[PDB]
Amino acid sequence: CPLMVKVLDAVRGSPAINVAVHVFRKAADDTWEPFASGKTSESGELHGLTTEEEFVEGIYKVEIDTKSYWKALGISPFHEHAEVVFTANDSGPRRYTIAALLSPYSYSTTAVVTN
Amino acid sequence: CPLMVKVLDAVRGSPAINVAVHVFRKAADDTWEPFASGKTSESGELHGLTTEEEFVEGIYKVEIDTKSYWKALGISPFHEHAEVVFTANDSGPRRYTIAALLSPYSYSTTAVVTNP
Ligand SMILES: O=C(O)c1ccccc1/C=N/OCc1ccccc1C(F)(F)F
Ligand SMILES: O=C(O)c1ccccc1/C=N/OCc1ccccc1C(F)(F)F
């Protein structure tokens, strides 16, 4: 599993469950092509988005639909979604974890790249 | 000044100086149209992007060119940029500050929204 997404809720101190996540890849014509998507599990995690052979070098965008999450909890949010745009680089055997921590008016995101 | 941007560097403990910032507004046809741009000052701040009259209700995107910033320091960072997408003035006109804290493999952003 070369690409994982983990989403946390900073208000409730819990995994952010049932959050929609969309992944896009930049095509040579500078357009976002849909690549993978899913909803976070009860652990706030989304696995199995792609395979090693499909996950090639390129520019990727991970979109986290935070607005619908906060609305379902009855909280007025600021952002439309959280976006994370990065370059996947094949230097060696690498796995990418995109982690996001969510509050109604703020979010943080980090990339953990391991073997 | 209804829209300000402030950018900090978490590695050096300083304002992030000379960072390019681009603001887009979602147009009628679902396309992102250019709205304003600038560079952060020696204080890490960017003011004067727009006026109250031109900053109407809409969906806005603030793109902070973090990659160019880290590269100029010799760091190959993870993100291409930091993007912040939000609806503005949906409840009437407000003053927005978009703040971002940058590290090579991480960033955080928060909005401070005040009523004049
Ligand atoms: O990521 C991971 O492999 C991970 C896996 C399992 C459980 C927790 C984590 C890490 N979750 O990190 C949350 C986060 C995300 C973005 C910025 C800052 C944070 C902080 F809360 F850690 F500060
Ligand atoms: O910067 C400033 O003087 C500033 C100016 C106007 C409004 C708010 C602020 C502060 N903003 O707080 C930045 C910060 C601090 C600690 C963690 C994370 C952040 C982040 F917002 F950058 F993400």
From Swiss-Prot, chain A:
Changing Y107V: Requires 2 nucleotide substitutions. One of its GO terms (molecular function) is molecular sequestering activity. Changing E80Q: In AMYLD1; amyloid polyneuropathy and cardiomyopathy. Its main location: secreted. Changing V62A: In AMYLD1; amyloid polyneuropathy. Changing V85A: In a patient with amyloidosis. Coiled coil: none annotated. The modification 4-carboxyglutamate is found at E33. Changing D9G: In AMYLD1; leptomeningeal amyloidosis; leads to unfolding and exposure of N-89 to glycosylation by STT3B and subsequent degradation by the ERAD pathway. Changing Y105C: In AMYLD1; amyloid polyneuropathy. Changing S41I: In AMYLD1; amyloid cardiomyopathy. Changing E45G: In AMYLD1; amyloid polyneuropathy. Changing Y60H: In AMYLD1; leptomeningeal amyloidosis; vitreous amyloid in some patients. Changing P15S: In AMYLD1; amyloid polyneuropathy. The keyword Isomerase does not apply. Not glycosylated under normal conditions. Following unfolding, caused for example by variant AMYLD1 'Gly-38', the cryptic Asn-89 site is exposed and glycosylated by STT3B-containing OST complex, leading to its degradation by the ER-associated degradation (ERAD) pathway. It is linked to Amyloidosis, hereditary systemic 1: A form of hereditary systemic amyloidosis, a disorder characterized by amyloid deposition in multiple tissues resulting in a wide clinical spectrum. AMYLD1 is an autosomal dominant form due to transthyretin amyloid deposition. Protein fibrils can form in different tissues leading to amyloid polyneuropathies, amyloidotic cardiomyopathy, carpal tunnel syndrome, systemic senile amyloidosis. The disease includes leptomeningeal amyloidosis that is characterized by primary involvement of the central nervous system. This is Transthyretin. The chain holds residues 30 to 144 of 147 of the full protein.
